[PDB]
Structure formats: C-alpha cells, structure tokens
Design a protein around this ligand. Structure first.
Ligand SMILES: *[C@@H]1O[C@H](CO)[C@@H](O)[C@H](O)[C@H]1NC(C)=O
Ligand SMILES: *[C@@H]1O[C@H](CO)[C@@H](O)[C@H](O)[C@H]1NC(C)=O
Ligand SMILES: *[C@@H]1O[C@H](CO)[C@@H](O)[C@H](O)[C@H]1NC(C)=O
Ligand SMILES: *[C@@H]1O[C@H](CO)[C@@H](O)[C@H](O)[C@H]1NC(C)=O
Lengths: 24, 272, 85, 45, 49
C-alpha cells in the first residue's frame, strides 16, 4: 500500500468505487 | 558638470565562466511541490560572461557604453559599496527619456528625465582633514534638466563610504528587464567570502517594485565612485583610487527553465 | 469581510466563486496569488491585513436518485456525490 | 517435509525482501490518468 | 422533470418504468448571493482639508 502511490477544482471530480480497500 | 580624463595604461577585460547564476522569480504567484516551466529571459549556465575589474592596485577604470538587450544580469560581489548607480538611454544627448537610478548615502531616487549625460559621470568622495569620515562632495552625474514628468523616491538605504583593499564579504545581483515598456528590478543580497570564480551556490532574486514608464532602452552604463585621500593630490587626471570591486555583465537569453519549488515556496534548482 | 461560505470575490486578478478558509502557510511579501500542482489559482492573499486564504469551490459533482424498482415502492432518495451536508 | 517447509519460508522472505526495495503494472495505470487529468486543465489555458 | 425526483428519473431515462439501480438526473450548483470587491485596504486620501 505504501510502495505504489486539486484535480477536482476544474469540475474533474473523482467518484469513489463501490468497494473500498478494506473490503478488498 | 563633468571633466575629461587623461590617457593612461589600463587593463583589458577578461572572460570567465558562470556557475548557476541568473535565476529569479518568473512571476508573482506562489508555487509549492510543482515542477512548472516557463518561457522568460534567463541566463544560460556554463556560458561565456565578461569580467571587468575596479581595483586600483594599476589605475583600472573601465566603464564603457554597453548595449542594453532584452534583460541583463549584473552581479557584483560588493564589499565597500563602490558602485553607486546606473544610467540608461539611447543616445545620451538630452534627446530621449534617460534613466537615473542612483543609490546615494541619504535616499534612493528614481528620476526618469532628460538629464545632460556627459562622457563619463562619476561621484567623488573627498576625505576631510578635521573629520575622520569619508563624505561625498563631487556630485557630477549631469549638467542640467529642462522639464520632465515622472519622479519617484524609493526607500532609504544606508551605505558605507569608506573604501578598503581587503577581500569581499557580500554579493549583490541586479537584473534589469524591459517588457511592454515596464521596468523590472530584481535585487537580493547574499553574503559570501570569495574574490573571483563565483561558487556553485543557489540564491533566488526577489523583485521590489515595478516601474511603468513605457519607453525603449537600447544602451546602458554603470557608475563608479572614486576616493580622494591625502595620498593623491586630488585631481581627476592621473592620480586617484577606487578601492576594490568586481562586477559581471551578462546578457539574458530567451531560454525556458524548469524550477523547483519546496514546501516553503522558494526556488531551489534550475534546469535548462 | 466574511469567511467560511461559498462567496464571490474580485481580488484584482480573478473572479472566482468559493469559500475562504484560514490557511496555515505564510507567503513571501512580494506575491499576490498562488497556484498548486494541478495548475489552479486557489490561494489569493487578502490585501487588507495580509491574511492568506484558500479557495475551495462550493459546487462539487451532482445529485442522484435511488429507485427501488417497479411494483415495489413509491418514494425515492436524494444522494449527493461530493457535497457535504 | 522439513526441507520443503524451510524452502517455502525462504521463498516468502525473498519476495518480502525484494518488494521492500516500484511496480510497473500498478504505476503506468496511475501515471497515464494523472497526465490526462493534468492535460485537461492545460486545455483551459 | 422539475417537481419530483421519481418523475425526474422517468423523463430523463425516457421510460415510464424504472428498475433497480443508480441513475444521474442533473447537477447541484451553489449560486452565490453576495459579491465583494476590495482592491485597496484603506483609500489614503491626500491632505485636502
Ligand atoms: C519552511 O517549511 C518548513 C517545513 O514545514 C517549516 O518548518 C518552516 O517554518 C518553513 N519556513 C517558513 C519561513 O515558513
Ligand atoms: C408487479 O411486480 C412484479 C414483480 O414481482 C412484476 O413482474 C409485475 O410486472 C408487476 N406488475 C405490473 C402491473 O407492473
Ligand atoms: C460538513 O459540514 C459540517 C457543518 O458545516 C461539518 O461539521 C462537517 O465536518 C463537514 N464535513 C466534512 C467531511 O468536513
Ligand atoms: C492596509 O492597511 C492596514 C491598516 O492601515 C495595514 O495593516 C495593511 O498592512 C495594509 N496593506 C498593505 C499596505 O498592503
């Protein structure tokens, strides 16, 4: 999780997925 | 009023190399943790730059009329505050709007007018007998002035009028640009202990105030100050002294540069 | 001077609509605006008392309607994407 | 059985020591989306 | 399409029946009701008394 790594200011919002990292 | 000089033995200017010099703030916005590039007038690294001397020990006094290009780089490892001011213009015959930015011992003046610039303007510092202090008395920069419009006074700055022959302790860089008629002044003081072959350190240059005159500048010339002690007879013909100074004249080229911004927001590195 | 609401200001260089939150970073005394990594002016220094404020928009995303299906119910629910309540 | 159990524990420690020293397939999918989002803000300029 | 979210679902999908699932009807934009313009801090009047 720590090995692999605002944009929403211009209407480019990022939607969250259905399943988070805890359920995966 | 001004006087003429007498022919004597001079020293020819040398050519040295720069080491990561000529980096200033390209805008008036804040940047942090972003690698952004812009297209402005900067100085290319490891380029051939001119070198002019001002140390007396002989009688070195070289102040020619160099052409002013789009952005210059004036770096001076000043120790005793020998270089006072700078002049600008095209023909220097009371025909255009000449510039006069002289750092005096009382206050900094910015007076763009039609002054009568002579062949060689210089300030003279006379040493009094009863007073053990160096005072400026020969104020020979121009002859007269008829009429002009703009006149601005800057913040007061204290200077040392005593000239020595020791090593330098400070370094001052000046960048003069002209875009759309606007004048830009980038000045920053940085202490260093060196006489020549500038180090590879990094230091940003912060501007002070924008001067919107709106004229064209094609030539420029620096002003040097001399001292009049009891060793010299006091005539500006063949016997004089100037202390020790060294200024670098560089021309900024239109090259894109990549800057590095930390969490503080200051410039750390520059990549051409 | 008002803060912490979706307001509109014109600080000599832009007309943006958003909020003005109290930042924790002090700027250098020669700048007026501030960009970021995403190339967006979201930090404008207030010329009143040199108070650094951040810009965050108030319109984020849109709405959403939840329908259980036909022959099941009649009421729905309103879902916001990235709008805090 | 004690030989393969020791070889299995040595194989896990070799993967853990190699992964602690970045991945390629999990980084190109993020760098391509980050450059595409940074391009859309540049289109407004 | 501007009265009920259930009726907004049917006309935007162009179907009189709705099955189970998520949909997007419109957006939510917050309109500011006030505007401030402050270029200087205090207009320093020159002495004219
Ligand atoms: C520069 O950033 C460091 C790291 O947070 C901080 O501790 C320091 O106070 C900052 N300096 C200034 C002048 O803000
Ligand atoms: C009633 O609900 C059932 C679902 O079990 C559906 O199959 C049927 O079509 C519905 N009736 C009508 C009239 O839509
Ligand atoms: C949403 O707003 C409320 C009240 O303004 C606040 O208490 C809450 O912390 C906010 N939510 C987030 C995630 O910041
Ligand atoms: C504006 O005036 C206030 C109070 O007179 C002062 O605190 C502030 O620094 C000023 N802003 C400037 C000079 O940008």
């Amino acid at each position: 999780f720590n090995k692999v790594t605002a944009q929403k200011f211009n209407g480019l919002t990022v939607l969250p997925p259905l399943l988070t990292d805890e359920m995966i | 009023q001004c006087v003429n000089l007498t022919t004597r033995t001079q020293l020819p200017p040398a050519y040295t190399n720069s080491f990561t010099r000529g980096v200033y703030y390209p805008d008036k916005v804040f940047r942090s943790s972003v690698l952004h590039s812009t297209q402005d007038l900067f100085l290319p690294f490891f380029s051939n730059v001119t070198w002019f001397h001002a140390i007396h020990v002989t009688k070195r006094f070289d102040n020619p009329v160099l052409p002013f290009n789009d952005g210059v780089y004036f770096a001076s490892t000043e120790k005793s505050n020998i270089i006072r001011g700078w002049i600008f213009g095209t023909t220097l015959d009371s025909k255009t709007q000449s510039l006069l930015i002289v750092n005096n011992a009382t206050n900094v003046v910015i007076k763009v007018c039609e002054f009568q610039f002579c062949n060689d303007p210089f300030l003279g510092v006379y040493y009094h007998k009863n007073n053990k202090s160096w005072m400026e008395s020969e104020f020979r920069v121009y002859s007269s002035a008829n009429n002009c419009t703009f006149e601005y006074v800057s913040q007061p700055f204290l200077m040392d009028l005593e000239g020595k022959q020791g090593n330098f302790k400070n370094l001052r860089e000046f960048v003069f640009k002209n875009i759309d008629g606007y004048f830009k002044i980038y000045s920053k003081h940085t202490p260093i202990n060196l006489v020549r072959d500038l180090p590879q350190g990094f230091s940003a240059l912060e501007p002070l105030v924008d001067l919107p005159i709106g004229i064209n500048i094609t030539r420029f010339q620096t002003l040097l100050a001399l001292h009049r002690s009891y060793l010299t007879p006091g005539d500006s013909s063949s016997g004089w002294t100037a202390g020790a100074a060294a200024y670098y004249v560089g021309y900024l080229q239109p090259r894109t540069f990549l800057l590095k911004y930390n969490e503080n927001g200051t410039i750390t590195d520059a990549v051409d | 001077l008002v803060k912490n609401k979706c307001v509109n200001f014109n600080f000599n260089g832009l007309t943006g609509t958003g909020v003005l939150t109290e930042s924790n970073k002090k700027f250098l005394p020669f700048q007026q605006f501030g960009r970021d990594i995403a190339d967006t002016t979201d930090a404008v220094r207030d010329p009143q008392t040199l108070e650094i404020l951040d810009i965050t928009p108030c319109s984020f995303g849109g709405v959403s309607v939840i329908t259980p299906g036909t022959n099941t119910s009649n009421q729905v629910a309103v879902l916001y994407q990235d709008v805090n309540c | 059985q004690k030989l393969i159990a020791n070889q299995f524990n040595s194989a896990i420690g070799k993967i853990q020591d190699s992964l602690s020293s970045a991945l390629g397939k999990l980084q190109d999918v993020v760098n391509q989306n980050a450059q595409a989002l940074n391009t859309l803000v540049k289109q407004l300029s | 399409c501007a009265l009920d979210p259930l009726s907004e679902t049917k006309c935007t999908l162009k179907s009189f029946t709705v099955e189970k699932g998520i949909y997007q009807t419109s957006n939510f934009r917050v309109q500011p009701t006030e505007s401030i313009v402050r270029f200087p801090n205090i207009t320093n009047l020159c002495p004219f008394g």
